[PDB]
Write a protein that binds this ligand. Structure first.
Ligand SMILES: CC(C)(C)[C@@H]1NC(=O)O[C@@H]2CCC[C@H]2OC/C=C/C(F)(F)c2nc3ccccc3nc2O[C@@H]2C[C@@H](C(=O)N[C@]3(C(=O)NS(=O)(=O)C4(C)CC4)C[C@H]3C(F)F)N(C2)C1=O
Ligand SMILES: [Zn+2]
Length: 192
């Protein structure tokens, strides 16, 4: 089937919030068709398949997300579904051309180690960067609270995107660190 945009998160300005755009029935129908009547607004899109829900982040004109969520599927669009311009299983990364209305986030270059994840519910979860692709949670939290936020943005204090949430370091139901796809990896991405 198709990946469907069932919601959005606008990060510019005040404390962000999530905005639902479709329901169960409409998302199933639109994953069957591939025709998305709704307009695209925001920098972070809530994405769903017939079975899974996750996030995508708009950077450099492209909606990026995780392969373990979208696989090789297409993204519903105005007229027809959009084909993936980027696919990399090793990086767990996939990318579709950003349609009209999708606002891109600017890459981070400040070197700030004080990052935060924006979840699918628009919660802010801070973490201290300790490597190229890892950041330690300031407080451990149950893994279930992070589920469904893969593909969401890992942000710097300035509002620029340092990375894309990919996986969690967890033990016995409790997450201690986030692992993400560095933003520098999305610019050096081969338009297949
Ligand atoms: C134990 C754990 C937390 C479940 C697991 N940790 C884990 O593997 O830790 C190791 C050690 C340190 C980093 C990581 O190195 C391995 C990298 C794995 C990977 F991620 F690159 C990945 N490449 C794939 C490529 C092709 C096909 C399948 C793939 N499957 C993968 O990983 C899988 C998926 C990923 C996941 O659940 N991501 C999140 C999420 O919310 N998803 S989701 O939206 O609900 C949903 C399932 C709908 C899409 C953000 C974390 C949230 F839950 F916090 N996983 C397992 C984990 O995070
Ligand atoms: Zn920055």
């Amino acid at each position: 089937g198709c990946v469907v945009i069932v919601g959005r998160i606008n990060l510019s300005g005040d404390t962000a919030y999530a905005q639902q755009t479709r329901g169960e029935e409409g998302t199933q129908e639109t994953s069957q068709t591939g025709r998305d009547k709704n307009v695209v607004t925001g920098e972070v899109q809530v994405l769903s398949t017939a079975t899974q829900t996750f996030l995508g982040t708009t950077v450099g004109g492209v909606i990026w997300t995780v392969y373990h969520g979208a696989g090789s599927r297409t993204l519903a669009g105005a007229k027809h579904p959009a084909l993936q311009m980027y696919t990399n299983v090793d990086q767990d990364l996939v990318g579709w051309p950003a349609p009209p209305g999708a606002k891109s986030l600017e890459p981070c270059a400040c070197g700030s180690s004080d990052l935060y994840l924006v979840t699918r519910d628009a919660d802010v979860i801070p973490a201290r960067r300790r490597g190229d692709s890892t950041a330690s949670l300031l407080s451990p939290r149950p893994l279930a609270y992070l589920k469904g936020s893969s593909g969401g943005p890992v942000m710097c204090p300035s509002g620029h995107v340092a990375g894309i949430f990919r996986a969690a370091v967890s033990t016995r139901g409790v997450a201690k660190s986030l692992q993400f796809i560095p933003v520098e990896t999305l610019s050096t991405q081969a338009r297949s």
